[PDB]
Structure 1
Amino acid sequence: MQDAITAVINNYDVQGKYLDGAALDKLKAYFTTGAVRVRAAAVISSNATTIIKEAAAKALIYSDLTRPGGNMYTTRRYAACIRDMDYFLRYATYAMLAGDPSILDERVLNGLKETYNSLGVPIAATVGGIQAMKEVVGGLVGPDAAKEASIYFDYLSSGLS
Structure 2
Amino acid sequence: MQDAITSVINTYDVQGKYFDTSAFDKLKAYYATGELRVRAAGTISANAATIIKEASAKLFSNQPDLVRPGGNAYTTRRYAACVRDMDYFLRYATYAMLAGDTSILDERVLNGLKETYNSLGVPISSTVQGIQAMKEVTGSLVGSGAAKEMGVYFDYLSSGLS
With the length of structure 2 as denominator, give the TM-score of the two structures.
0.96
- Taking the aligned partners of 1:14 and 1:121, their CA distance within structure 2 comes to 39
Deviation at 1:143, TM superposition (A): 2.3
Unaligned runs of 5+ in 2: none
Aligned equivalents of 1:16, 1:120: Cα separation in 2: 45
What is the aligned partner in structure 1 of residue 152 from structure 2?
151
Kindly provide the amino acid, as one letter, of the partner of residue 149 in structure 1.
Answer: M
1:2 alignment partner AA: Q
Equivalence for 1:14: 14
Give the letter for the 1:22 counterpart: S
Give me the identity figure in percent. Answer: 79
CA distance in 1 between counterparts of 2:72 and 2:121 reads 8
**Aligned length in residues:** 161
**Map of 2:100 onto structure 1:** 99
How far off is 1:113 after superposition? 1.4
- What 5-or-longer segments of structure 1 have no aligned partner? none
Q: Once superposed, which parts of structure 1, at least 4 consecutive aligned residues long, lie more than 2 Å away?
A: none
Deviation at 1:144, TM superposition (A): 3.3
AA matched with 2:143: G
Indicate the RMSD between aligned Cα atoms, in angstroms: 1.1
2:134 matched to 1:133?
Answer: yes
Between the aligned partners of 2:15 and 2:118, the Cα distance in structure 1 is: 40
User: Which residues in structure 2 correspond to 1:82-93 (within 5 Å)?
Assistant: 82-93=83-94
Q: Alignment partner of 2:130: what SS?
A: helix
- The structural deviation recorded for 1:33 is 0.5
**Are 1:60 and 1:125, in contact at CA under 8 Å, matched by a contact in 2?**
no
Aligned to 1:39: 39
1:127 CA drift (Å)? 0.5
Deviation at 1:16, TM superposition (A): 2.1
Query: How many Å apart are 1:146 and its aligned residue?
Result: 1.4
Q: Which moved more, 1:51-60 or 1:9-18?
A: 9-18
Contact kept, 8 Å, 1:131 with 1:153, in 2: the verdict is yes
Measure, in 1, the Cα distance between the counterparts of 2:69 and 2:137.
28
> 1:63-97 CA deviation, whole Å, 9 max, x = no partner?
11101111111101111010000000000000000
| 2:72 pairs with 1:71 | yes
Provide the TM-score with structure 1 as the length reference.
Answer: 0.96
